[PDB]
Amino acid sequence: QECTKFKVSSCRECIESGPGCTWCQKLNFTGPGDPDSIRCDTRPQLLMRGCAADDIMDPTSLAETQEDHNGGQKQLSPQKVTLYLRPGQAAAFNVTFRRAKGYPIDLYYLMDLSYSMLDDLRNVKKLGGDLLRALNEITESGRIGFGSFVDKTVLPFVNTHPDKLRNPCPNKEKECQPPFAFRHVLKLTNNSNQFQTEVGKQLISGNLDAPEGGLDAMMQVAACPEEIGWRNVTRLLVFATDDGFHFAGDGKLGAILTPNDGRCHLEDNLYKRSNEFDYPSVGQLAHKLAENNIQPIFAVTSRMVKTYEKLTEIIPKSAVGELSEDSSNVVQLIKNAYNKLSSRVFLDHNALPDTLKVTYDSFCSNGVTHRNQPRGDCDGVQINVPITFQVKVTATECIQEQSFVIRALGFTDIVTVQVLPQCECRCRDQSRDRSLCHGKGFLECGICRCDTGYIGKNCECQTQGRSSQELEGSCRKDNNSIICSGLGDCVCGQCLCHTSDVPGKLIYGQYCECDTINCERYNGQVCGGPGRGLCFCGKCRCHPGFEGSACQCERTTEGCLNPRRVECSGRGRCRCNVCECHSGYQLPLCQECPGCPSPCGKYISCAECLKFEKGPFGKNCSAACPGLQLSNNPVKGRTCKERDSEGCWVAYTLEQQDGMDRYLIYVDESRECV
Amino acid sequence: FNLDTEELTAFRVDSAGFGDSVVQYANSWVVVGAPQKITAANQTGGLYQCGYSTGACEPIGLQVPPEAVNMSLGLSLASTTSPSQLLACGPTVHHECGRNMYLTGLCFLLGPTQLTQRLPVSRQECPRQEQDIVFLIDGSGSISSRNFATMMNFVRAVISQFQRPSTQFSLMQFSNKFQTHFTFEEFRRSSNPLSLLASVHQLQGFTYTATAIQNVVHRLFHASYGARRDAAKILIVITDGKKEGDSLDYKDVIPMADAAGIIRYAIGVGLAFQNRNSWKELNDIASKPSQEHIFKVEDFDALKDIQNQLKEKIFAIEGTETTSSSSFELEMAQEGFSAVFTPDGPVLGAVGSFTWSGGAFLYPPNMSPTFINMSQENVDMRDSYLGYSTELALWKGVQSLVLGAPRYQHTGKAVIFTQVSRQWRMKAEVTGTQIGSYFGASLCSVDVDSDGSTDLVLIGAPHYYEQTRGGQVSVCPLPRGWRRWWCDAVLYGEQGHPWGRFGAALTVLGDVNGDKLTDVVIGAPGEEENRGAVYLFHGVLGPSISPSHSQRIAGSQLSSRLQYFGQALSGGQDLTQDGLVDLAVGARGQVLLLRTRPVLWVGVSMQFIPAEIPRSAFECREQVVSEQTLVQSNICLYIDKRSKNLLGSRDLQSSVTLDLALDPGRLSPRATFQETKNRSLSRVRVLGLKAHCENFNLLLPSCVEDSVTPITLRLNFTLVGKPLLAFRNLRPMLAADAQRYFTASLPFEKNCGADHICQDNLGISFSFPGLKSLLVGSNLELNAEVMVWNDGEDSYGTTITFSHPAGLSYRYVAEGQKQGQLRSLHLTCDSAPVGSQGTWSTSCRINHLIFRGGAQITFLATFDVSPKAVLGDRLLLTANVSSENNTPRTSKTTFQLELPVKYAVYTVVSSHEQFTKYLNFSESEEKESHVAMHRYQVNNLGQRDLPVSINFWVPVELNQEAVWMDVEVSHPQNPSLRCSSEKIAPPASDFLAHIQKNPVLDCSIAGCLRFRCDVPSFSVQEELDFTLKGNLSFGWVRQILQKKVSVVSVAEITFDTSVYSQLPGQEAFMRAQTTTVLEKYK
């Protein structure tokens, strides 16, 4: 199959060469004056040479599925995978996951209390008897909690004196509560009517800056249930606000450069730290949040729908809910929650050491035959239909025995996957044959490994003073080659490559022909430095995730992808995280061709065939006008403005998108026949 | 890689938020910031200047005005060098405008001059609200004379509670007629307005409610009477009955009033109103909602009990159209949040401009300042803090500013602005990569080289990730030619440590290692367990940085106990006055200074006086002696790259340890030095910028086994001692690429037989397979197919060297999986500078095997060539070929060839959209002049100035019938250039049918007109544009007997096909077109 020889001194050093490397233990396999490194070839070659089949030591990777009894864990099996992983060779173990039933639920209503959330507070202050009613079907005795939030106390997030601070309410001043940021009004409780009545109590507040500081509330919530309390099963949250959201970095405005610690420190179910404390970074949730098995459910105005949409991409288990400004269709959010929240099966793992690389496969239930990618994104599975993930773990070197875990994001089920460095190849010891190797050496699967001072295939020679006539036979690759390719003095048939005390430098091989320094460079580093790849006799063996002549095309990834998740938009192969845009399309993702004519001609005919109805000319339209979209919105960019079929100047912008002649227009509701 | 981590200075002044923001001041000092250094009543912080001489920080004197409150100065800092000045800021000034205070910002300019204080210190006064209230009163006969003086007494009352000129009043009374007692003009002018209130008398009479209302808003609310134009219109009414005899109706009056936007209140008296026939005239009268703008009463006397209530409803007035939204201007813009200088005055940044869009205020030389937002026509950019960070971008031409917008669409975009003469528009921009990434936090214009023209720009995004949340900095060069610009000339540096906040800050450090390639520093106070961290990168060639950093001085460097360090940092100035630049990095509590240790590197030459071995002490013999032969080996050492350290002390003297060793890798020493008798030796000797050559004695034993393999001699060398006169160098060192292991070979006179004399005969020849034209830009790699002979004795360590211009070097091919009639070959190549000025040799000895008999062999050697390859209009290259046994004789066998070289250029041309497509039906006669205008814009994104000549093709004559006459070409915004003119006649085919196919009128039909506008030197980036016009005749339109015809002009740019070409393969962007239409019917 494949096997390039690294320094081969024992059967183990043959294994550390690659997956397709096998070793022969059969004695008397070495000819009159043949190398010991010949014992290490490919299984096929060994048989062609004569090496018996049962003499081919071949440590291969496999899996130990120690399945539990039951109620060990529920729908993630197996529960304990003890893999024996040989470097370079991939071990594959499957993962059966058949979600079963709805466990105890635990909701929490994060509502922004502003003057814009007035009729929201009215049409919601006490509609919770239909929440348990909407909870009745699937889950049983769940829990219900509430938490309010506005924005940081101190400016510039809201005027900090004066007694508008005691009275922020704009114009009505209906005794609204003091400006706050997070008030834990209700704890997770069984009752439902007590919950409603404790809510209506509190009235709104107000702040200055338009977007909110709701992110600070997020952490403070799932930070210390030593005072808030939380169920040990499920934990769903729901964001609600007709306003933006502030993240880290914005605190510098309020003269606060103390980052977010992660733990909440309240004394009266109310924050008094958010002031002496900076905003939680955007990414400080997908970690902490997803660590406590909590998952918000975005539900805001249509004005803020596609901003939280981009937020759905990043953080896991999160849905987008466009609703009216009255919060009346808020309970239908959760009919859309379990819809695609019980659907996102995840299968990531604890941050593994760099010495390892993990991947997965996917076999969704409705049709999908995925292969080779992290995660386990199958947005088409729900109640009681199992799934299939093929976890393939590979190593680069002979790891040290350790252990990691593969969890499902948003699930308490831990799968303790044990990992064992499988390399050594037991065979014999130095009780059998202290004879051969002339007493000054031991034996290991045939060959003999001599002492510091003895060398030779039978420890017959010593590392001082030796040489013969035709022992220099297999000591040179061919008749017209210099002995040991220089940089190596031949002793007893074979060669002993000289040593260089220079970083990296190392000679090796039967005739000392290969080195670990003379390969293809990259960024002023050998085979891409020790990070990217390595050097071995000219060719670079790039680490996992890196390909190319010298790991030049450093990443096998595709940063050539945009949010559209189509490579290089229109045209351009994705080589080395770079697009090769056809024509004059420019970088990085090939969308704008600055020099292009920005053609509006030939488009007028179809512009009046879509917005206005002034006759699809050549034929009809939607056929001669595959600029299929005509959004009812202020799209922009290619601001065009030409005339119509008969006189009038028809205005319209023209936002191109992705491939070939695909477009998106808004034709101004106006004309000009002057 | 030369940032001191031992002997540095540390200022630990414990003053709260001390060491939170820092900057390099006039070289002698460093200024630190402590925003939270409480002073007085919740006021400022304070600054500190620190000198190197004595490790101590002295407070800095400041005249903090009582006006500026809780501004916590020092938070934002900035310093210039032109003339040395410094700038600090309190971006949190608090000025109490009553109801609610805001944030304005206040800065100070210090230096060896006058202590200026610039916004400039017009203590930013609160906002003035404009109200134009109009009292309307029923004076019908139903009201008693007693209830009258009481009501007009309540009127004056509600007038005093207000203050002018920010408020205004106008009164009218309405019964059966309508008297305007005093207008808006007679209120702001009359020093005593209430003097006219007690002057009015009752009217009695009938009642026409609605009628007066119109007589009020269509007169008193005119800008003519004095009612301010841009104002808030309020109207109040006080009546005791409905409208009877009122010849009008509310169905006409109410609408047109709400048009001008007039909030309507109502105050009734009688309680006859609480009937269902007199309650609707309070709702109709007032403006929606009805339950807010009304306050009915029974008694005129206790009408002043609600005098206490009306206080509020009117003051709370802000704006009622878009459901009471929240707009702004410059109340909480905290100007000076981030500042940076520039040849034409400093530049502070505002954040809360309007919809918190953002911007920056520029201050010229005592001329009033300007300001740059994004205009309002820019719908987006709401809440982005445009100007959170600010940086300059000087260029050979005009300056350019840059503002950071962390939260554009909540992701983060960065926008670059230019200030063209009477323009100040936007150059370009780039969105962020991820939501919350915060793309825009930090920015730094840096200079890969030292040409003085800012080449590229860094960007910060500490809170970004995909799997690991280390942070993210983004390199983004500064392409010229607006509307195109990419933060992706590839790369973006990071680190393998989540929650690190990498990119929090950064500054240009400049040339530290002396390879002409500026180097930058970058902070990351979140690394490790909250511990601090900093990074060091280097440039390469033009727009680029090296992802792999050389150093990573973090908070584990016996920084006993600081939590997050690197928050901010600025360097580039020599303050310790030990020659080279210094770096200042702020940290919580204290701030450190890391100097840069001098990096010199050295070149070496090795040789063996006796070239090879004469076979005298070769195979030897055993009667009598070892006459141990005496080989001499001379090595020399000299340092050449110096520019930074300059002549004189240190750049010269520097002792060194030498460690020579022969045949190291083998346990069979082939020789020994005489001085020590060992197989190796060491001696410490003095170096200089002038060579130091010493030859040593070597002893070869008469008899030896291996002779084929030359004997190696390598040296390990370093820099021992490091005492040099004063301690003003302290520690010098070597660079990254330190090939401290240099080896030279000594061959042997191989036995080519008991006779036959060993004739060295080798030839050589090479070519370039498929190499077409070779222009600099394309054809980066250069594939050379070299063949070689051996028509003589066997060459063992045969070597093959090339001569080439500086613009290229050899890179290993490493091709394989299985292909060739070709290379197979492990060979060792070493580049090196040779000739006087320019050329140099890359030798390549076929390392480890023999080249025998009349055998030929072919291998492939490839040379990367730089896109900016300085080389003549022709490039030659040669190939010396010889054996290991050197060249014992006369005429060399070199092989050379010379190639024509060209150079890449990007040259594009567009048809500006100011183009006259004008067809329309009014075509009664054959007139002349509706001159059309074909504007063509052109520009080159190449990288070299190159002459050009822009050609044109404008139709005119058409069978004697002119198409459009007197056509010339204007060249505005540029000198009067010379253009040529020539007429030509097309092929003359049947044009009848020709354009019937296509209404087009290209030059192939009508006698066209070529314009050859030459150009002296089309400097890169130059968008040299120009247009052409001419009265367009309608006569020829009939000549062809159709309608809706269209005439086209072609414009093609040209340049010397030789020397220059265009790069990508083939782009026709150098040939634009403009099609005008002459559809005129009837």
Ligand SMILES: *[C@@H]1O[C@H](CO)[C@@H](O[C@@H]2O[C@H](CO)[C@@H](O[C@@H]3O[C@H](CO[C@H]4O[C@H](CO)[C@@H](O)[C@H](O)[C@@H]4O)[C@@H](O)[C@H](O[C@H]4O[C@H](CO)[C@@H](O)[C@H](O)[C@@H]4O)[C@@H]3O)[C@H](O)[C@H]2NC(C)=O)[C@H](O)[C@H]1NC(C)=O
């Ligand atoms: C920098 O950025 C801004 C904002 O992004 C650009 O656009 C400005 O946007 C504001 C929007 O509020 C424009 O509004 C101005 O309002 C002033 C007073 O408030 C009036 O408007 C509100 C809303 O209708 C009313 O409710 C209130 O009662 C007031 O009527 C006006 O005084 C402004 O000036 C206008 O009238 C004055 C009369 O003195 C004229 O001199 C001006 O020409 C102007 O017509 C204005 O209406 C504001 O117009 C915008 N500025 C500009 C210059 O257009 C800015 O364009 C941008 N700045 C620059 C220099 O580019």
Ligand SMILES: *[C@@H]1O[C@H](CO)[C@@H](O[C@@H]2O[C@H](CO)[C@@H](O)[C@H](O)[C@H]2NC(C)=O)[C@H](O)[C@H]1NC(C)=O
């Ligand atoms: C500045 O204002 C702050 C509060 O914003 C003061 O801090 C304390 O505030 C509380 C609540 O108003 C007062 O009851 C305390 O008396 C304040 N503490 C002290 C020690 O006075 C702070 O005092 C003010 N600082 C100054 C010097 O004016």
Ligand SMILES: *[C@@H]1O[C@H](CO)[C@@H](O[C@@H]2O[C@H](CO)[C@@H](O)[C@H](O)[C@H]2NC(C)=O)[C@H](O)[C@H]1NC(C)=O
């Ligand atoms: C030049 O090179 C040799 C080998 O690197 C130095 O010898 C030391 O040898 C040991 C291994 O036997 C290395 O671990 C050390 O790094 C080497 N030097 C030390 C102590 O750092 C030798 O010292 C060098 N010659 C000099 C003195 O410049």
Ligand SMILES: *[C@@H]1O[C@H](CO)[C@@H](O)[C@H](O)[C@H]1NC(C)=O
């Ligand atoms: C895992 O599942 C796939 C597809 O069902 C199957 O082909 C493969 O054999 C399974 N792997 C193991 C280890 O059983």
Ligand SMILES: *[C@@H]1O[C@H](CO)[C@@H](O)[C@H](O)[C@H]1NC(C)=O
């Ligand atoms: C002499 O030779 C030995 C072995 O090569 C070496 O270790 C030692 O350093 C040498 N001594 C001197 C004085 O050079």
Ligand SMILES: *[C@@H]1O[C@H](CO)[C@@H](O)[C@H](O)[C@H]1NC(C)=O
């Ligand atoms: C090859 O060319 C270089 C050019 O300077 C010269 O130094 C060298 O002697 C040449 N080699 C031989 C021996 O032909």
Ligand SMILES: [Ca+2]
């Ligand atoms: Ca609402």
Ligand SMILES: [Ca+2]
């Ligand atoms: Ca530069």
Ligand SMILES: [Ca+2]
């Ligand atoms: Ca440098």
Ligand SMILES: [Ca+2]
């Ligand atoms: Ca210095």
Ligand SMILES: [Mg+2]
């Ligand atoms: Mg009356």
